[PDB]
């Protein structure tokens, strides 16, 4: 009955927002990650790291504000406020990209806190920990994309900047430089996200269209009671419908809901793996057979060769402004261009 | 194109001629499919989290459900008791019909917008 | 010496067979292009 | 086309070996019942 047990008691009180031991890590880090993003997008420039404006204060709107990555010259510096780059100066820290590492690291530790919170609450309530396990997927995506990826490249400069448009630029970068759409790990991710969305829509509609008449109202929501023991829709009629429409249907409710966990979690894990490879420029950029043929046979053309021309345009047309530290000067005469355009 | 790389060609050229990424209806399509995948995982994990013990550890828990049984196979009050504490009480469903309508509505509506 | 008491039968039902073969075949269909390169 | 010759055996064992594994487990499941 010492201080540890007393504090345990207090952390685990049932209240409007549960705290728990996990809350000591989660709440500071989540709030700081969030606060750093709102602070930076509202007030802080990217002029000295990127040559970009990036705050409401500067004229940007919700789509174009960002907390941008630090300058390529910082390497993988933690960019601690008290570190050797900013030397304790908050203003310079902001101008040097410090809010980026601040948000990424506090966000990382906040993600850990949230998954610990899932464990903690599930243990106190007596349920199995599969929600925590499912959340490993967004963790894997975050760390692979925001941490592992720029750690394999030259600096944090090439991580995603935290903004709507800045993420759009990240996508396009990955098309042109990494040919990421050609990567089977992304493809598996796509299947998993689209497949998850499909499962979500098809399961909700099946339930809502195989309901039992359990009340007299035309609003069928009222005829459900959370403590009833009886299934609220007919698995049997749902199974018949889908067997006759599609050939196959679910017949096991447990398998159905596990499968709903499995599909998007697996897809996200697969994409994380591909991004790890791209950390090293280990791309699925080319098909060698196609290039050998096309080099020799100028009449051979495929959608694969057409997309590489697009990549080549993306790179040459965006590199000087997207990578200002390189001082790329491409005269007009070297820019690849088709006829007229 | 009716092809995998042809699909990519299509979406690249669409971005150059239209900028689909800066278009709010595409942004809602992303919210529809990302949120769709999210809620797929959530629902799957919450139901799977609250399966009622019906089996031994040497057998698939899936054998605790029999096609056509009248009783529910998980405890929705336990799931709600977990998720409402994960967030707060009123961000969690206690009505399975509203829950599954929401599952249906979010991705359908987001994909309407993106189409 | 007694026989080992920890032994257990293993199972794979027909639906799991169909699901696994589909997984394998679709994966091969996806990766074969990259193996031939 | 000048493809990797080993892609064929790679693809063949990638299909064959896990498929055989499943079939073995399936058939011995039926003959219990």
């Amino acid at each position: 009955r010492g201080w540890f047990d007393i504090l345990d008691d207090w952390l685990k009180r049932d209240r409007f927002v549960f705290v728990g031991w996990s809350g000591i890590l989660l709440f500071p880090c989540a709030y700081l990650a969030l606060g750093g993003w709102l602070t930076g997008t509202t007030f802080v420039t990217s002029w000295y790291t990127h040559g970009l404006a990036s705050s409401y204060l500067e004229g940007c709107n919700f789509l174009t504000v960002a907390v941008s990555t630090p300058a390529n010259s910082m390497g993988h510096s933690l960019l601690l406020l008290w570190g050797p780059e900013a030397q304790g100066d908050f203003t310079r820290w902001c101008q040097l990209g410090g809010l980026w590492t601040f948000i990424a690291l506090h966000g990382a530790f906040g993600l850990i806190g949230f998954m610990l919170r899932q464990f903690e609450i599930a243990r106190l309530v007596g349920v199995r920990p599969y929600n925590a396990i499912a959340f490993s997927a967004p963790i894997a995506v975050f760390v692979s994309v925001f941490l592992i990826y720029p750690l394999g490249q030259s600096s944090w400069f090439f991580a995603p900047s935290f903004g709507v448009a800045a993420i759009f630029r990240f996508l396009l970068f990955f098309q042109g430089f990494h040919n990421w759409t050609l990567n089977p790990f992304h493809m598996m991710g796509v299947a998993g996200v689209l497949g998850g969305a499909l499962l979500c829509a098809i399961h909700g509609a099946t339930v809502e269209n195989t309901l039992f008449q359990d009340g007299e109202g035309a609003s069928t929501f009222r005829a459900f009671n959370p403590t009833q023991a009886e299934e609220t829709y007919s698995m049997v009629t749902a199974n018949r419908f889908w067997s006759q429409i599609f050939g196959i249907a679910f017949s096991n409710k447990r398998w159905l809901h596990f499968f709903m966990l499995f599909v998007p979690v697996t897809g996200l894990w697969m994409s994380a793996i591909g991004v790890v490879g791209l950390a090293l420029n280990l791309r699925s950029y080319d098909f060698i057979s196609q290039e050998i043929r096309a080099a020799e046979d100028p009449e051979f053309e495929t959608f694969y060769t057409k997309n590489l021309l697009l990549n080549e345009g993306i790179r040459a047309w965006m590199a000087p402004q997207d990578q200002p530290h390189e001082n790329f000067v491409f005269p007009e005469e070297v820019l690849p261009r088709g006829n007229a355009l | 194109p009716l092809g995998i790389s042809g699909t990519f060609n299509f979406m690249i050229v669409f971005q150059a001629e239209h900028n689909i990424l800066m278009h709010p209806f595409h942004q809602l399509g992303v919210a529809g499919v990302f949120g769709g995948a999210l809620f797929c995982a959530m629902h799957g994990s919450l139901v799977t989290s609250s399966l009622i013990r019906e089996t031994t550890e040497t057998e698939s828990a899936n054998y605790g459900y029999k096609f056509g049984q009248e009783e529910e196979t998980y405890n929705i009050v336990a799931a709600h008791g977990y998720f409402g504490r994960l967030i707060f009480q009123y961000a969690s469903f206690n009505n399975s019909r509203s829950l599954h309508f929401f599952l249906a509505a979010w991705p359908v509506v987001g994909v309407w917008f993106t189409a | 010496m007694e026989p080992n008491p920890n032994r257990q039968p293993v199972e794979l039902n027909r639906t799991s067979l169909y699901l696994g073969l589909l997984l394998i075949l679709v994966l091969a269909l996806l990766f074969s292009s990259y193996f031939f390169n | 086309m000048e493809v990797n010759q080993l892609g064929l055996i790679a693809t063949a064992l990638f299909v064959l070996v896990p498929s055989v594994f499943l079939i073995i487990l399936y058939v011995q499941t039926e003959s219990q019942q």
Binding site: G247 | G68 | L29 | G7, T11, A12
Partner: peptide, 30 residues
């Protein structure tokens, strides 16, 4: 040889669809 391989896998999948639909384990009530 690559063409033969691609088409072989595709045809095996179609064949699997056939068994999965017409030779499924029947769902049986309780």
């Amino acid at each position: 040889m690559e063409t033969i391989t691609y088409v072989f896998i595709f045809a095996c999948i179609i064949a699997l669809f056939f068994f999965a639909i017409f030779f499924r384990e029947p769902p049986r009530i309780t």
